[PDB]
Design a protein around this ligand. Structure first.
Ligand SMILES: [Cl-]
Ligand SMILES: [Cl-]
Ligand SMILES: [Cl-]
Ligand SMILES: [Cl-]
Ligand SMILES: [K+]
Ligand SMILES: [Mg+2]
Ligand SMILES: [Mg+2]
Ligand SMILES: [Mg+2]
Ligand SMILES: [Mg+2]
Ligand SMILES: [Mg+2]
Ligand SMILES: [Mg+2]
Ligand SMILES: [Mg+2]
Ligand SMILES: [Mg+2]
Ligand SMILES: [Mg+2]
Ligand SMILES: [Mg+2]
Ligand SMILES: [Mg+2]
Ligand SMILES: [Mg+2]
Ligand SMILES: [Mg+2]
Ligand SMILES: [Mg+2]
Ligand SMILES: [Mg+2]
Ligand SMILES: [Mg+2]
Ligand code: NA
Ligand code: NA
Ligand code: NA
Ligand code: NA
Ligand code: NA
Ligand code: NA
Ligand code: NA
Ligand code: NA
Ligand SMILES: [Sr+2]
Ligand SMILES: [Sr+2]
Ligand SMILES: [Sr+2]
Ligand SMILES: [Sr+2]
Ligand SMILES: [Sr+2]
Ligand SMILES: [Sr+2]
Ligand SMILES: [Sr+2]
Ligand SMILES: [Sr+2]
Ligand SMILES: [Sr+2]
Ligand SMILES: [Sr+2]
Ligand SMILES: [Sr+2]
Ligand SMILES: [Sr+2]
Ligand SMILES: [Sr+2]
Ligand SMILES: [Sr+2]
Ligand SMILES: [Sr+2]
Lengths: 56, 194, 92, 237
RNA sequence: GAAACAUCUCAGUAUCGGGAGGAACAGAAAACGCAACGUGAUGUCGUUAGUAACCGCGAGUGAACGCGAUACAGCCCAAAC
RNA sequence: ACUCGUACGGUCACUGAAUCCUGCCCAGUGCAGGUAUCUGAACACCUCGUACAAGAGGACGAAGGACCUGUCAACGGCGGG
RNA sequence: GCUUUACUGCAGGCUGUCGCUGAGGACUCUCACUCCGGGAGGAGGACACCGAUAGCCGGGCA
């Protein structure tokens, strides 16, 4: 069984869903954590300085 | 004449001698069985508390905080580093234990602001400090001429920004001349070389 | 090679020939208080210590004479350029 | 390199854990105040997944139903006694002090009241040798003379299920079923059969530990493999 | 970067944790030490100066007092009684 | 974590069903034990030095090493004449 | 990436020392502290744990 096309057929698991807090399809329904805004992980909003160039 | 307070002071100059030695030996047994932050009704060192700003008034709180003794509890480097940035054992943190204690206290009492703190001893594995906190929202304090300054907005979370006396000493702001070139007006503005 | 313990030669202090006594220079003990010593203590810590992590080199197959020429009259000594000598024994 | 298997274990992930959710109970001795007036009846005999040995269900006078570390010879209907004044009989529990010298014991406590620590596996037994007012000398299954507090409780007799070790597994599949009931990663891949990155003995064309196997006691984890602080090796000498 | 490299450099930089404000921080000398019969809280700007100092004394790192400016403001406890 | 586990246990390794067997070597390396004597850091102690301090030396000496011993189903070895 | 008796270091282990730490070169005690016990109480004990430092080992790791 190849890692490519043949293995893509088994993909029918729902994980990332629309997030109640930010509206992005990043709420991981299994972990119950939003990979975009961090809902379910932190009260504060997920944010990082590396999300932009250093001097901007 | 000598104040009654001067006696508490003089006793605390040598915590390992006299009656104080026995008091500490007794007390610590109880303290060791207490939590990280225990609110106390009266300061253990009255003279020191009053000297630091304490008042037997509404909105004044005193709490004893215990912190593990010694150096930094640091995790060794995952990725590659030069020998200089490889050390793990002898590296100590830049903030003293008293400062760690003040912050733990203020976090326990979110609505209160750290006024000052002092040491109340230690054993072989931990240190104890009593922190004086103030309620900036209580009128008994908003009306106090000696304490109402702590009610100002810019005094919010003062301990977390190093505005406490222990904060200022730890930041090397004691000296007004030689030696304070990289500390005043802030460590950050001097490129963090202090 | 051999060499006379005492012999007449020029003394730069008296500014005239006088009998001198030759002696091999004995190493003087260190005080451990020179600037270099303090730099070693200051700059040494965790990890590599730069120059202070280096260990002393080797030896040359033969060393140059290391001697003191002490004047027999004024008692003052003077140094001279040394010469490679596999061995140096004094006569008397 | 990479952390060796012995280090992966420490993390306590699923692969290395014991099937605790499937286990029955810790066969600790009952806690009696005094008087010995605690006896019970063996209501059933059960298999213990954690020890591959039978264990007995007892129903005590005061209404307590508990599983017991059963010695050989215990059967349903039999009455068991636990306490200072207990009768000196197989399956009965009482302190070493009340036990007569030269009597096989099992499930011996290390410190009075702990519930039993020594001699608990299939067929084994400790031997109560010397008595005293301050110390009871017991010979453990390993042959070691152990000095214990005479107040330490123990059960008379040898542990049930003796001779288990006498029959060979014969096939891998049999070992397999047993390992599924324990906290152990099985089968076992030899160090010498792995890559240099995976173990101190890996690498090199043909297989061989490129170094002596007897490792120092002071060796750090990751290096401490092979023959740990061996006083000697081989069969000769 | 040092034409390798380990002290050093990149740099207290990137990035991370915590926190305040419209600005922060600092601040009324246990100062300075152009040594004086002198200056007089604190920031900041210009300069002092790539100077003093550091440094496989290599590559590099690098102030301060003072001075000219900006703006100027000095006070409250603890204790004695 | 192992572990609702306790030497008929479980950890760490090697060999690889049964059958018949598995010799010699402890010098080196590894592990382990012992050790009169030798060596062996810091603190405290003593001598010199400094009205103090830096520093020099001394005494004592842990593990370790030297030294002895055990050990190859321990790393491995089993030649030339 | 990997190896080792390469260079230089870092974890970790062992060992001494100082603090915790008390009373009367070997010892006794209990009161801190530790462990067992539901509890009473028992075991141990100024040691061990822990903080600091020193010497040894140290491709386990950079
Ligand atoms: Cl605060
Ligand atoms: Cl010469
Ligand atoms: Cl098995
Ligand atoms: Cl001036
Ligand atoms: K670098
Ligand atoms: Mg049990
Ligand atoms: Mg399994
Ligand atoms: Mg295998
Ligand atoms: Mg392979
Ligand atoms: Mg490896
Ligand atoms: Mg092989
Ligand atoms: Mg370069
Ligand atoms: Mg530098
Ligand atoms: Mg600023
Ligand atoms: Mg160069
Ligand atoms: Mg710089
Ligand atoms: Mg200056
Ligand atoms: Mg094979
Ligand atoms: Mg095979
Ligand atoms: Mg416990
Ligand atoms: Mg490497
Ligand atoms: Na607070
Ligand atoms: Na320095
Ligand atoms: Na280059
Ligand atoms: Na390079
Ligand atoms: Na340098
Ligand atoms: Na001038
Ligand atoms: Na040998
Ligand atoms: Na590669
Ligand atoms: Sr496959
Ligand atoms: Sr699927
Ligand atoms: Sr969460
Ligand atoms: Sr953020
Ligand atoms: Sr806040
Ligand atoms: Sr330094
Ligand atoms: Sr170093
Ligand atoms: Sr040479
Ligand atoms: Sr148990
Ligand atoms: Sr229990
Ligand atoms: Sr190999
Ligand atoms: Sr043999
Ligand atoms: Sr002014
Ligand atoms: Sr075979
Ligand atoms: Sr040997």
């Amino acid at each position: 069984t190849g890692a490519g096309t043949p293995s893509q057929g088994k993909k029918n698991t729902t994980t990332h869903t629309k997030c109640r807090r930010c509206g992005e399809k990043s709420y991981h329904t299994k972990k119950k954590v939003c990979s975009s805004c961090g809902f379910g992980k932190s009260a504060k909003r997920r944010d990082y300085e590396w999300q932009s160039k250093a001097g901007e | 004449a000598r104040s009654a307070y001067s006696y508490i002071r003089d006793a605390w100059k040598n915590p390992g001698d006299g009656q104080l030695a026995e008091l500490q030996w007794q007390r610590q047994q109880e303290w060791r069985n207490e939590g990280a932050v225990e609110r106390i009704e009266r300061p253990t060192r009255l003279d020191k508390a009053r000297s630091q700003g304490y008042k037997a008034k509404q909105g004044v709180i005193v709490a004893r905080v215990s912190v593990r003794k010694g150096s930094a509890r640091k995790r060794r480097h995952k990725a590659g580093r030069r020998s200089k940035r490889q050390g793990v054992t002898r590296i100590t943190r830049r903030k003293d234990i008293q400062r760690v204690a003040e912050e733990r206290a203020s976090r326990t009492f979110p609505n209160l602001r750290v006024l000052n703190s002092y040491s109340v001893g230690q054993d072989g594995r931990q240190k104890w400090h009593e922190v004086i906190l103030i309620d900036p929202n209580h009128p008994a304090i908003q009306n106090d001429d000696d304490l109402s300054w702590i009610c100002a907005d810019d005094q919010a979370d003062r301990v977390f920004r190093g505005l406490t006396g222990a904060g200022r000493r730890n930041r090397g702001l004691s000296g007004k001349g030689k030696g304070s070139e990289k500390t005043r007006p802030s460590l950050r503005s001097n490129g963090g070389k202090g | 090679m051999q060499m006379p313990r005492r012999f007449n030669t020029y003394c730069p202090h008296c500014n005239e020939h006088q009998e001198h006594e030759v002696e091999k220079v004995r190493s003087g003990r260190q005080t451990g208080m020179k600037w270099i010593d303090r730099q070693r203590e200051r700059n040494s810590g965790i990890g590599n210590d730069g120059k202070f992590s280096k260990v002393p080199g080797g030896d040359k197959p033969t060393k140059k004479t290391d001697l003191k020429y002490r004047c027999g009259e004024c008692g003052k000594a003077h140094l001279r350029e040394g010469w490679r000598a596999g061995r140096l024994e004094f006569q008397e | 390199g990479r952390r060796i298997q012995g280090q992966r274990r420490g993390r306590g992930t699923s692969t290395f854990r014991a099937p605790s959710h499937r286990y029955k109970a810790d066969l600790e001795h009952r806690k009696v105040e005094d008087g010995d007036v605690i006896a019970g009846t063996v209501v059933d005999i059960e298999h213990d997944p954690a020890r591959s040995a039978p264990v007995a269900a007892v129903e005590f006078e005061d209404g307590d139903r508990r599983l017991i570390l059963a010695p050989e010879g215990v059967g349903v209907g039999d009455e068991l006694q636990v306490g200072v004044s207990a009768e000196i009989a197989p399956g009965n529990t009482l302190p070493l002090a009340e036990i007569p010298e030269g009597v096989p014991v099992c499930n011996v406590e290390s410190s009075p009241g702990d519930g039993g620590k020594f001699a608990r596996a299939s067929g084994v037994n400790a031997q109560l040798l010397t008595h005293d007012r301050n110390v009871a000398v017991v010979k453990l299954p390993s042959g070691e003379m152990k000095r214990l507090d005479p107040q330490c409780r123990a059960t008379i007799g040898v542990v049930a299920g003796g001779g288990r070790t006498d029959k060979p597994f014969v096939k891998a599949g049999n070992k397999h079923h047993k390992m599924k009931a324990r906290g152990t990663k099985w089968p076992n891949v030899r160090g010498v059969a792995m890559n240099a990155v995976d173990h101190p003995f890996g690498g090199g064309g043909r297989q061989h530990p490129g170094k002596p196997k007897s490792i120092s006691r002071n060796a750090p984890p990751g290096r401490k493999v092979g023959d740990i602080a061996s006083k000697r090796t081989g069969r000769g000498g």
